[PDB]
Amino acid sequence: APDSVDYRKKGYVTPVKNQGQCGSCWAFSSVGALEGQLKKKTGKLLNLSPQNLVDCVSENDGCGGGYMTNAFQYVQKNRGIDSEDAYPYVGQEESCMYNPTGKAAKCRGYREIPEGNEKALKRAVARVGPVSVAIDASLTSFQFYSKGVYYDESCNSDNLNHAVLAVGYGIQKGNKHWIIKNSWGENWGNKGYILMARNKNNACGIANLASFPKM
Ligand SMILES: *[C@]1(=O)[C]N(S(=O)(=O)C2=N[C]=[C][C]=[C]2)[C][C][C][C]1[N]C(=O)[C]([C][C]([C])[C])[N]C(=O)C1=[C]C2=C([C]=[C][C]=[C]2)O1
């Protein structure tokens, strides 16, 4: 077989989604990883509730931003995360209204990939499934990406400002990459996804704050 992987072909990744005017990328990145482990464990692909996270992970700041680890920790000690269906995404923080009745998954903690180590991230994506990663999506070059293996010498691995999901990795025009599921609607980039540079000195800090939930 090939030196690459794509969990979209295993039905691990739900349809692209759109944050709207809410800094909820962390929530979508978290839901993404959770959904992947859920499919892997129960064989059912399902959208988990990003709003549940936005309104209940108090260690984060709702539409102000957050970390995926805090999100996984929350799911763990809250002993559950509601499904999208049971806790719709309204794109604006409101009081926590988590309901045990709509629980569609749980977490048993999380593991973090060694900072800046793309080989470790590769192994993780291989062993586990979709992995949450943080990146530098400042550059306008990132803003209107549409195809190819994105790479911009101007990216700053120290400037992590967006949270997304790594659902695979491979090669293209002889370009090693990471298969990234963004959350700015299917309309953005190649159907919501974007291929980012791999083994290129940790371009855009793809491996500086990666993690996955245990389930
Ligand atoms: C996320 O929604 C990404 N948006 S964005 O609009 O998609 C965008 N992305 C890149 C460049 C420009 C626009 C922007 C900001 C909100 C949000 N980002 C985050 O939540 C990041 C996530 C990664 C760095 C891990 N984290 C925070 O901003 C953050 C973490 C916090 C916090 C407040 C309190 C506690 C933890 O903010």
Side-chain angles (χ1 to χ4, degrees):
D3 297 303
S4 67
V5 54
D6 187 321
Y7 287 106
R8 288 178 295 186
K9 302 172 181 175
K10 306 282 192 51
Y12 276 30
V13 316
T14 66
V16 171
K17 309 207 160 52
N18 204 312
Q19 316 181 197
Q21 308 298 311
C22 175
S24 55
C25 52
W26 59 272
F28 288 96
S29 175
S30 303
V31 168
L34 282 176
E35 295 174 344
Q37 287 310 292
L38 182 62
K39 197 290 180 297
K40 185 180 180 165
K41 314 295 178 191
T42 60
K44 297 202 299 302
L45 181 63
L46 175 60
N47 295 148
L48 298 178
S49 176
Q51 190 68 54
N52 186 177
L53 298 176
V54 170
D55 312 321
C56 306
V57 181
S58 62
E59 308 64 39
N60 285 165
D61 192 49
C63 292
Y67 289 129
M68 295 73 86
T69 51
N70 287 165
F72 298 143
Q73 201 70 294
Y74 162 81
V75 180
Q76 180 275 298
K77 56 183 174 62
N78 186 62
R79 306 216 45 49
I81 184 176
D82 279 345
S83 65
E84 169 57 56
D85 186 55
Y87 206 139
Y89 180 61
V90 294
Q92 42 182 286
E93 50 197 303
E94 64 212 306
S95 288
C96 179
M97 296 162 294
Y98 165 78
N99 179 48
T101 293
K103 171 180 172 57
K106 40 229 301 304
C107 186
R108 331 222 271 219
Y110 60 91
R111 296 157 88 83
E112 300 171 54
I113 275 64
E115 176 173 34
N117 185 327
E118 288 185 80
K119 271 60 190 61
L121 176 55
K122 180 179 179 186
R123 292 187 290 88
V125 171
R127 277 82 155 173
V128 190
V131 173
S132 289
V133 306
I135 55 164
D136 176 0
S138 292
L139 284 39
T140 69
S141 61
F142 185 101
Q143 229 77 169
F144 25 86
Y145 159 92
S146 58
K147 43 183 292 188
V149 170
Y150 180 81
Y151 174 69
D152 194 316
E153 40 114 295
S154 286
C155 238
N156 176 25
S157 61
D158 283 350
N159 180 24
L160 307 175
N161 42 63
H162 184 28
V164 64
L165 191 77
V167 182
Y169 62 76
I171 303 78
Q172 206 176 59
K173 280 46 280 182
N175 287 144
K176 280 192 174 74
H177 69 270
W178 292 108
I179 305 182
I180 303 299
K181 173 180 184 189
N182 194 4
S183 65
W184 298 344
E186 287 190 357
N187 205 167
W188 180 83
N190 182 343
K191 233 180 314 310
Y193 293 74
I194 174 179
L195 286 48
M196 295 173 76
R198 187 156 65 76
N199 305 186
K200 255 176 179 175
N201 306 310
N202 185 42
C204 302
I206 183 76
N208 273 0
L209 201 66
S211 65
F212 56 92
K214 296 186 190 180
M215 199 177 95

